[PDB]
Amino acid sequence: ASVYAWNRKRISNCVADYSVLYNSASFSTFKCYGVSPTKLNDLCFTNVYADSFVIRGDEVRQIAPGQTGKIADYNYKLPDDFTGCVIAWNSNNLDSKVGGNYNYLYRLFRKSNLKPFERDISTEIYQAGSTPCNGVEGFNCYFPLQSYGFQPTNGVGYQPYRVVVLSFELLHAPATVCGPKKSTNLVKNKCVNFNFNGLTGTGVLTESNKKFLPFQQFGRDIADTTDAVRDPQTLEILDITPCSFGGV
């Protein structure tokens, strides 16, 4: 998709291996924020959003929290508390035409900056001056979208790049998107090292009478530690009691 109309795919209820993605050397850019890729194939998320678009080389650096430019201001803006990874690779062999590929566009004029994760695909005439444009292009009335050249003989900074931005959200909910590994059986009334949808800790798992609502997946204590979890396979509530301890 064009960067001004960047496509978004919502990934849910599936199993993915990010380790194979990181293993692949097709990617020229792979910087993660708030989470490292080596520690990505053992964390479950509730939803994964895949934003994809095409920009040129020297604009790849603008896909990051707190960056400025035509793309980050008018086309695709990332929040400052962004948690995810930015992936890009040179797509000159696919997105370039001998006469120039004019299908990839970008927003050049806009009255203000985009909010984080906002998309603006309007084709209204940009009123640059004081006189209204009434949807008529011309003097002080610009078309807001400009097209990339994208020719094979272009410099690397002007060659097309395909960007995929994965953003991870930890909604307090049943984490469906997980990495790998099989599940195991659950042992009650014993001290175990548990992992429920990516949430780990140590404690004794027992039966409970805590009536979680259908939308609630985790409970918390005063200290913000996990109090109880809902088993992702059988929708029962299990209390987590830290393993027996005391002074000696």
Epitope: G100, Y102, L108, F109, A128, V136, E137, G138, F139, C141, Y142, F143, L145, Q146, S147, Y148, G149
Partner: antibody
Amino acid sequence: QVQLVQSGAEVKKPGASVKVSCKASGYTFTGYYMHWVRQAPGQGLEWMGWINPNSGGTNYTQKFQGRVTMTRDTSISTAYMELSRLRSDDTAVYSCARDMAFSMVRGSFDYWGQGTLVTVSS
Amino acid sequence: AVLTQPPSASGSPGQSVTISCTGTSSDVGGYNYVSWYQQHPGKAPKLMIYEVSKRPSGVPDRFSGSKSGNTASLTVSGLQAEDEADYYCSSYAGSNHWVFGGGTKLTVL
């Protein structure tokens, strides 16, 4: 380096139509507005209109409305100007001039074509 | 609406000459988008001044533009033999239309 190469000279009779081409090179063709100007031999410059190679929008001055047609083909970076219902005093050298502003029309031309003489003889 | 331009301006070598360009309140006096072009015989016009007084790169400082009311002015100080050419003014005229001046021949006496 910007180059605007126009088609060859044309000889026409009154009532016919003519199509002038203007192939650009050395820059992103969609990035700059293209203007069309004609100049009668010995006389002055006359503005005809402009086209945006990006959006495709056009505007023509009043005296040429109904007879002029400006188009472009982005795949070959060529702009076209068509003038219909030709008359004797339409004999002039027609030129395509690139607007120097980037993705805006501001009426200042920094690159011109060599011109295309269109002769409407008796 | 044509821009009124004197037919002939002239001066001796080294002298200063001013070429006027009178429009109306809806083109010259309405917007600060007046331009000036220089055309030598048989060659394409060359932009010398745009936006009334801004000079493109490569244009000599001897060429200077200005505007007062509905009348613009192109001034050429230190006139030289190579400055002998035709000079056309231009201006936005509203309604997405630009207009030219009649043209002035500049002759080195």
